[PDB]
Amino acid sequence: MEKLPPGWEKRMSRSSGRVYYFNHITNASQWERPSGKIEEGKLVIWINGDKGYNGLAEVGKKFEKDTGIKVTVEHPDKLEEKFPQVAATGDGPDIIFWAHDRFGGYAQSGLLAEITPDKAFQDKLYPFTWDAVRYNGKLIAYPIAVEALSLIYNKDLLPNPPKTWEEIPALDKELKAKGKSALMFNLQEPYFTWPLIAADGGYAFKYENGKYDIKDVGVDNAGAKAGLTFLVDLIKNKHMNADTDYSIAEAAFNKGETAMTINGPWAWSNIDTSKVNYGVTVLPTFKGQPSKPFVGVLSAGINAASPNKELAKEFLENYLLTDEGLEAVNKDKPLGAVALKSYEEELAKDPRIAATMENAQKGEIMPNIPQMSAFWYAVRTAVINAASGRQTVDEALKDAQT
Ligand SMILES: OC[C@H]1O[C@H](O[C@H]2[C@H](O)[C@@H](O)[C@@H](O)O[C@@H]2CO)[C@H](O)[C@@H](O)[C@@H]1O
């Protein structure tokens, strides 16, 4: 019989003589034993579909060829919503891949095991990536790659990309004279509009530690209002459409219909085959200030209820987080600037990667506070409601902030 995951208490129902389980962290109650659900002797991995999951699977076969231990890569939709649901019952994948921002929430709920890399392995990764996966003093995941949004532009349509958001409206005008658009990017996910929204740090940026104040002052401030108003105004003046998602933006750029998009390194792959001559460069400034994308560190956390933690450790440390492991993933979909020093040193020669790190260091590594999931949803609603005209910018942001 396996040991119980953190927070779990085993109990007896006096009325039926039936054992049940109660979790003091999540208040979850159930008849099935939380441990013992995840199958032992194999590795099941969840990663997002836009990532190099097929490349990750190659590392999985390499692991199986060497060890006999099967590795299974799955990419469900909304895995960031599904993992906490199942793992809170003791079920789910052994390893979950996602940006670090959601791991703090997972960690507080007792869903992620503390990882145990020794000092020698820690030296192999940049310390700032270990910081992204530290929750309440504990390392709760293996950092993989640094994800910063960059301005991606068509070199043929636009040899000299705009340095400011402000000059885009007029640029869109003279590109419409060509039957083109200046800029199209996913307006449905707050991840993509945030760099503009946070740009102006006049009201909510903390110079004490270089962090945007999302919990005290919050998104209801004049700086965020200016950013979202500029966004809405591009839409009213018809330089952007409120309905543009990832799919639409991607297609239009890779068909050369628009001069610019905003996206991460995972997107480079599809552009490469489209053979648009593209550049990856710094995001435009707004109000004299650099855009501040929330930077994600794609991380691999281990399920607290998993019986394969040492399997997971071996796989992540000695197969994935190597030069040949990351390359296998990187060739499938570009990871961005990796956490592994030795591999990143080769990638840093790539100007696209230099551009990624440049936007990263102008932006901010996301907080991993438990509230991140609520924050993202609040901002998303505000943007969507402001952009559709359903609310004004003040109202949208007032309601967003609580
Ligand atoms: O839009 C909110 C969303 O932003 C981030 O998600 C990114 C993710 O980090 C990237 O790896 C890529 O998959 O695009 C996502 C945006 O669609 C946050 O990590 C996520 O928690 C948040 O919901």
Numbering used by the authors: 1 to 402
Could you share sentences copied from the article?
In order to reveal the atomic-level details of co-translational folding, we determined the structures of a series of nascent model peptide with increasing amino acid length. The topology of the WW domain composed of three strands and two beta-hairpins, which form an antiparallel beta-sheet. The structures of the intermediate-length (WW11-MBP, WW17-MBP, WW19-MBP) and full-length (WW35-MBP) WW domains, which are fused with MBP at their C-termini, were determined with X-ray crystallography.
On the other hand, WW35 (full-length) has a three-stranded beta-sheet structure, as previously reported for the X-ray structure of the full-length WW domain15. The three-stranded beta sheet-conformation of WW35 is correctly reproduced by the method. In WW35, the loop arises through an interaction between the backbone amide N of Ser16 and the carbonyl O of Arg21. Consequently, the hydrogen bond networks of the intermediate-length WWX are distinctly different from that of WW35. WW31 and WW35 have beta-stranded conformations. Additionally, in the case of WW35, the circular dichroism spectrum is not affected by the concentration of TFE. Therefore, the folding of the nascent WW domain is eventually stabilized after translation of the full-length domain.
